Structure formats: C-alpha cells, structure tokens
Amino acid sequence: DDNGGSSVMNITGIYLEDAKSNVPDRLVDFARLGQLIRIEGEGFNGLKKVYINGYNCYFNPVFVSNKSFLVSVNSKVPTTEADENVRNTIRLVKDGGEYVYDFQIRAAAPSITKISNCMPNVGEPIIVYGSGLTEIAKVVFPGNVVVTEGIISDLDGEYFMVDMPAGVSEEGGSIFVEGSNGGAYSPAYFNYKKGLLLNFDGVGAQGAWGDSESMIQTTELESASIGEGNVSQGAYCRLPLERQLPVAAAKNRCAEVWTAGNGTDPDWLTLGVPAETPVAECAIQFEIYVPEPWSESGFLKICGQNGFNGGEWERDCYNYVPWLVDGKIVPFQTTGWQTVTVPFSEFYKSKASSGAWTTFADVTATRASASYANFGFYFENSDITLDKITGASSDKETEFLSKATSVKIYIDNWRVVPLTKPEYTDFPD
C-alpha cells in the first residue's frame, strides 16, 4: 500500500522519470532542470509546497501518495546563482510541518564546442567555449595532466579560462572538464602535433618555386616573437608580404605560400585520422595572428592542391573571411595567436553535387590524384556576395565590394586534426 507509512516526512530516494529511457524509473543522485522526478519516502499525504533550491515548484496533488509523489524541476530553478543557504536542497511543506533534504540540482549537461588556441606554449592562456561550463573544478589535458588551480569560469557558463600546464602529451586529444553541471569533452584536436603539415621549424617543408610577385619565398618568413597571450612559435608566414603592398582593389592569388608537395610531403593517411572518418569529423587547423583590425575586403584561400587560379568558390579549397560573421561586417582582430578550424565538410568539394567528399579517404584520394599535391594558402582581395558563402539564392543581393588593402596576417602550424568528441552521458547503455 502506497498510502501507508508514518505522518513524519522522510525522503528515502529520488528517481528520474523518463519514458525514452532503458531504466524509465531510475534511482539518481542529482536531477537536472526540466526533469520529472519521483520522490520516494513517507508522510507525503497532505503535501502543500515543494521548494527546489528555494524555488516554489508546482506539483500535481492527485499524483501524491503517502510514500511517493511526482514533481518537475522547473526551468526557472536557480543553480549556480541560487542562495548558498538553499542551494542543493529540496524542502517539503505541509500543515503539520516541514522537511529539508540535501540533493544536487544541475542545469543541462555541459558542452565544449571550441578551444581558443589548440597549440599553445606552456603557461599561456587558453579560453574554452561552450555551454554550462559553470564552476569548473578540474581540467584534464591529453596525457592525464590534471589542473584544479587557476580555472576561471563564466558566471553564465559560456566559457572558462585556464593556463597551459607542462607535460601535455604530444599525441594530443580531447580536454576533459568537471564542473557543477557535470563532465564534458572537447573535440579530440588539442595539442595534435602528429597531424602537423608545416610549422616552418622542421615539421614538414616549405615549397618555393619561380619569381612571381605573389610567391612567398623561403627567405621571406618572419620569426620575431609577436602576439599577446598566445605568442608566435619559431618562424611563421606573413601574408601578404610588405613588398606586395598595397594589394589591388580587385585581384586574386595576391600572395601564396605552400608545402613542398609532390615528393616530400607525408602520406596524410599516417596523421592519425582513419580513412573512414566523415568530413564533418576531421579538419585543417592553423593558428592565425591579425594584430590590426581586418574588414571590408581580403580573404584567405586554403588550397588542398596547387590547381587554383584564385577567386574560386568551387573545388577542394576554402575561403576564410573572418570579418563576415552572420552576413555582417565585424572587424577581425586577435590579441595573440588563435586556432582556426576548417572541417573538411566546410570545403566546397564536400558541398558538391556529384563527386562530393564524404570521408577522409575521399580527401586522400583527391591529393593522390592531384597534379601538384602542394598544400598551401592564398591571400585574395576580390568582391564578395553573401550567397557564395551560404545559400545560393537568398543572400545573392548582399555585396561586400573589395577595396585596396595593406592588412597584415600571420599563419602557422598547418595540420590535419580529428574532430571526434568522446561520448559523456549521465547514464550510458
């Protein structure tokens, strides 16, 4: 009998009610906002109020039995912003008395969607973005490098800050965190030195040929320490070069830098990304430094192969226009070196109608069949229409006319990375 038991309130266990779960009535040690919980115990007959973290939560009195009742954890219940004296409590009120019970209340599980710099130096600042990243207590780096000190979390849990510790594995991988809302993994692309194509300091080789005005020679790199927070590492490429300025109001292939290509470049199948990996789960990464604001005109063309004339929006290439956020001009500037992730899915060849890219094997096939396997970049200063970036009809009218430019951009650590994010669920199958 559910209507039996004493008149003195008591909670013995809290269960999560989920119709879409393998354990639809599951005994739990925490509850999240929006969840329906079943509170089991005694003396619940005549229940009048339920407060969760001091917030009055509606409950249906007809679902109340003396040993069990159902209550939804209202979306407006405060968690990290709840008063310390009521935080993580369930209080029950009836005419004959009240009962307080210590129980952990969380918001949605945390998520890491982006790391500001995926190849920092020891002691440099890192910004990790996502959601629900409130009160981060632990950050773990590839190689089981544990950090519990110097973690500053956003009050709104959109980010946290932490310095790069010593001893992080050169194999790289995901970062892992523990905060008030639980655990989360980043994509597996942090400190991924095994995917390095070119760093201009001995990993890979710069390819240079001819005497063209656009050609960046091996003798035309920079090595002075530049950037605040994330500082340059060894030599890197400046593009466009000082000698190439000012770059013409409407021109393409204005500046170019490449890998050695045909002959010495590695087999990309040896960079730790399996052939079967989908194009949305692997990418090209590089660190960028834009000291002065960049807007109105100019863009970077990542060339998967040498066969590009300049000004394309079509094959195994990608046009990085960082001053166009949501079809809106927003000046682009970095305090220091920041990682740029370009999934192979974002490449125009992966968005093609026929021989479209589906996996990394399709990327390796293309580079093996390419006339010139030089991986590289183009600085480009030609006219833009928001459709060439997004939807081929709706944004066709919006134009961003190209102008003369003398913008300074620096790139480094070109690499292939995996974007696979390990699974983290409250209760796995």
Instruction: List interacting residues with Zn ion (CB under 5 A).
Output: 199-201, 233-234, 236, 412
121 or 335: CB nearest Zn ion: 121
Closest CB 410 distance from Zn ion, rounded Å: 10
Q: How far apart are CA 298 and CA 66, in angstroms?
A: 70
Closest CB 412 distance from Zn ion, rounded Å: 4
Rounded to 5°, the CA angle 320-325-327 comes to 100
141 or 410: CB nearest Zn ion: 410
Closest CB 396 distance from Zn ion, rounded Å: 40
24 upstream amide cis, omega within 30 of 0: no
Cα of 280 vs its chain's centroid, Å = 13
236 or 308: CB nearest Zn ion: 236
Which residue number is nearest to Zn ion in terms of Cβ?
234
Token output for 103: 């129980």
236 or 348: CB nearest Zn ion: 236
Closest CB 202 distance from Zn ion, rounded Å: 9
Token output for 400: 């961003």
Closest CB 335 distance from Zn ion, rounded Å: 19
233 or 252: CB nearest Zn ion: 233
Closest CB 16 distance from Zn ion, rounded Å: 50
Q: How far apart are CA 422 and CA 425, in angstroms?
A: 10
Longest dimension (CA), the chain: 92
Segment (H or E) for 10: strand 10-17
339 or 420: CB nearest Zn ion: 339
* Residue the block writes with tokens 């990304």: 273
DSSP 164: P
154 or 412: CB nearest Zn ion: 412
| Residue ranges with strand state E in 134-240 | 138-141, 145-147, 152-153, 159-163, 176-179, 182-185, 196-198, 206-207, 237-239
236 or 379: CB nearest Zn ion: 236
Nearest to 421 by CA among 270, 283, 269, 230: 283
SS3 390: coil
Closest CB 201 distance from Zn ion, rounded Å: 5
Closest CB 413 distance from Zn ion, rounded Å: 6
Q: How far is CA 267 from CA 70, 124, 190, 204, 272, in A?
A: 59, 32, 21, 11, 11
